[PDB]
């Protein structure tokens, strides 16, 4: 119950989406090479699949 | 009993079926050695068996 109240109101509800978008914006201004962009995107997707607790 | 199996909302994951077909088509065109073929098939069965969030 404690978790749900912090998770849905108290603290960050979208920790996944938050970092997923925040990485993207931090990545905005640099001229990031395609060699990079592919790996970062697929890995970010990999982050989007998995459970928050996964070690 | 077959329709009872089908008429349920707890059957084979759509996500797993998509990956299943995806890796199959991925193998569709390769000159695949037997070792990887059988290992891939048994592992695909294991993929079908498992729940969508286990590590």
From Swiss-Prot, chains A, B:
Known partners and oligomeric status: Homohexamer. Organized in a ring with a central cavity. The ATP-binding and proteolytic domains (AP-domain) form a hexameric chamber, while the N-terminal domain is arranged as a trimer of dimers. DNA and RNA binding is stimulated by substrate and inhibited by ATP binding. Interacts with TWNK and mitochondrial DNA polymerase subunit POLG.
The protein's name: Lon protease homolog, mitochondrial
Q: Tell me, what does this protein do in biology?
A: ATP-dependent serine protease that mediates the selective degradation of misfolded, unassembled or oxidatively damaged polypeptides as well as certain short-lived regulatory proteins in the mitochondrial matrix. Endogenous substrates include mitochondrial steroidogenic acute regulatory (StAR) protein, DELE1, helicase Twinkle (TWNK) and the large ribosomal subunit protein MRPL32/bL32m. MRPL32/bL32m is protected from degradation by LONP1 when it is bound to a nucleic acid (RNA), but TWNK is not. May also have a chaperone function in the assembly of inner membrane protein complexes.
**Which superkingdom, per the lineage?**
Eukaryota
**Where in the cell does this protein reside?**
Mitochondrion matrix
Entry's disease: CODAS syndrome: A rare syndrome characterized by the combination of cerebral, ocular, dental, auricular, and skeletal features. These include developmental delay, craniofacial anomalies, cataracts, ptosis, median nasal groove, delayed tooth eruption, hearing loss, short stature, delayed epiphyseal ossification, metaphyseal hip dysplasia, and vertebral coronal clefts.
Family per record: Belongs to the peptidase S16 family.
Q: What is known of its domains?
A: The Lon N-terminal domains are crucial for the overall structure of the protein, maintaining it in a conformation allowing its proper functioning.
Q: In which tissues is it expressed?
A: Duodenum, heart, lung and liver, but not thymus.
